[PDB]
Structure 1
Amino acid sequence: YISRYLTDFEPIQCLGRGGFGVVFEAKNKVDDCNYAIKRIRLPNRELAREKVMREVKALAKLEHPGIVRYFNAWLEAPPKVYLYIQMQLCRKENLKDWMNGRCTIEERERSVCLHIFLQIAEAVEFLHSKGLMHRNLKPSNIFFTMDDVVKVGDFGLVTTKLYMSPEQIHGNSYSHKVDIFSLGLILFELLYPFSTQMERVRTLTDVRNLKFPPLFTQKYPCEYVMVQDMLSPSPMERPEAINIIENAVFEDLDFPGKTV
């Protein structure tokens, strides 16, 4: 048996694992570029397999500055079936890591945080404009290109339900509005640095229930209102992504070092 993966690529390292998958960094021999390659073991469940095959076809159609860049997908059946998915390689440190390395207010300057958030919201608006949704938006699914461009995807590098809409937690039917709820908590978290995991969990749990730290409401009155709206228990009451991105807070964002 000839393995397409082993023939075409030089493996570099394991980047991680999660769900049906394992992810490698590998260099393509012909083009000399390094990629992230996800190897998904197809499940022994026909309905789950149906979903996997649909999802790869869907992701292959997507092109947007804030969405992970697709290259190829293929199947291998060594004498178990594996689906390989080849994407652009992002930096090792994702948004969760980035926030964990910036634990002071000085390291979360408003314009920087809003610039990062805007890119996430724009990726979400793109999905919604295509009649798609993310469903699992959270900092561990938000990475950066080598040049710090925000990239949204379904990464599956398990190292949480904190960002999940109430309707999803309860196992109810849902709409694209689930992503708006996730966005609300992410906006808050970007603006509000933590010193401990315990502090993070307690505060984000309170924020889910619209209980905000007084110093956040005072420092960021505009974003406070935005987060409140995004975290409405009623999905109908949450704003569309397009209305979030058109908010006045996102106008003429600048910071020293910003790409010009």
Structure 2
Amino acid sequence: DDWEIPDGQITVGQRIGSGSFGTVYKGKWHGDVAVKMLNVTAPTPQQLQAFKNEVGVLRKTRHVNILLFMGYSTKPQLAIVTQWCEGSSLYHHLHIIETKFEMIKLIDIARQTAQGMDYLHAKSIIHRDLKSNNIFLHEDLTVKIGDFGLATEKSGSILWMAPEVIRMQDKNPYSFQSDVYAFGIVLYELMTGQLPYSNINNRDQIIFMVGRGYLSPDLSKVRSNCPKAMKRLMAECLKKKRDERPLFPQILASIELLARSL
């Protein structure tokens, strides 16, 4: 396969967001597209390697619930082209404009996320930065999971981090279950319409306490109309001890059960 888009083909439209590791533009390329470019002048050996990593990971994915990769560009600057996403991220909906979703819809959002996560994990891919920000409600109807983060070098958002990741275990604390915990927080987000630890205004303390398990999401905050099976699944995903968490085939199965009888 070869997915390189020759220079000049893409019409770089309006700037969206900029970060340490790339600037995003809306664009034209056989229809609307999103264009993330990872440098302005000198491409660093690191940048060039992380460009290859990101493309490489992205092109392993073909699933409705994951952002559609469409192509990459090297001349004149290292760029990754994906589908354009119409709408808002889940973080934006819940925490900025407070869209009041119904339970049916919330559970469905959770379902579609679990559906995509399932895929990623199945494809030997660990997300490493799941959060309602990287859950895009495309067309308000279909969840697209990507990594829209610009601060990190795709080769931190602390609330979604698992204790063993927030602590420090040798080199690789990241696992499927590290992703699962993040999903747990995301479930918490749907069910409380709120961020965890909203009543603590100190970052360091949160980091420290989550790590030592002195702090945990206050689960008694769930919307009353939320199913009890959901609350229970949420707690499973949020278990402090890493190996006690369910994997995604199991999570998915569980969500689909409570979805059908409602």
TM-score range normalised by the length of the shorter chain:
0.7 to 0.9
Supply the AA of the counterpart residue of 1:133: I
For 1:89-238, list aligned pairs within 5 A. 89-100=84-95, 103=98, 107-146=100-139, 148-156=141-149, 160-172=157-169, 173-174=172-173, 175-194=175-194, 201-202=198-199, 209-213=216-220, 216=223, 219-238=226-245
Deviations 1:19-46 (A, max 9, x none): 3100000112xx3x11000001298764
Percent identical among aligned pairs is 26
- Cα distance, 1:188 vs. partner? 1.3
Partners in 2 of 1:252 and 1:58 — Cα distance?
37
Q: 1:44/1:235 Cα in 2 relative to 1: closer, same or farther (>3 Å)? A: farther
Partners in 2 of 1:124 and 1:163 — Cα distance?
15
Partners in 2 of 1:240 and 1:76 — Cα distance?
41
Supply the AA of the counterpart residue of 1:40: L
- Cα distance, 1:211 vs. partner? 3.0
Does the 8 Å CA contact 1:108/1:192 hold for their aligned counterparts?
no
Deviations 1:62-103 (A, max 9, x none): 1001000011012125xxxx3210000002421111113664
Partners in 2 of 1:116 and 1:223 — Cα distance?
13
Match of 1:18 in 2: 19
Deviations 1:194-225 (A, max 9, x none): 4xx7x86238x799615323565785422221
What is the aligned residue count? Answer: 236
Does the 8 Å CA contact 2:88/2:138 hold for their aligned counterparts?
no
Match of 1:257 in 2: none
Supply the AA of the counterpart residue of 2:9: D
Partners in 2 of 1:52 and 1:65 — Cα distance?
23
Match of 1:256 in 2: none
Partners in 2 of 1:50 and 1:157 — Cα distance?
16
Partners in 1 of 2:177 and 2:114 — Cα distance?
13
Match of 2:154 in 1: none
Supply the AA of the counterpart residue of 1:250: A
Partners in 2 of 1:113 and 1:225 — Cα distance?
16
- My pick for the range that moved more, 241-250 or 114-123, is 241-250
* 5+ residue gaps, structure 1: 254-260
Deviations 1:169-206 (A, max 9, x none): 22322221111000111111112124xx7x86238x79
- Cα distance, 1:49 vs. partner? 4.2
Partners in 2 of 1:10 and 1:46 — Cα distance?
27
Match of 2:258 in 1: 249
Match of 1:258 in 2: none
Partners in 2 of 1:101 and 1:209 — Cα distance?
23
SS in structure 1 at match of 2:24: strand
Does the 8 Å CA contact 2:130/2:179 hold for their aligned counterparts?
yes
- Cα distance, 1:17 vs. partner? 1.6
Supply the AA of the counterpart residue of 1:12: G
Partners in 2 of 1:19 and 1:34 — Cα distance?
25
Match of 1:27 in 2: 28
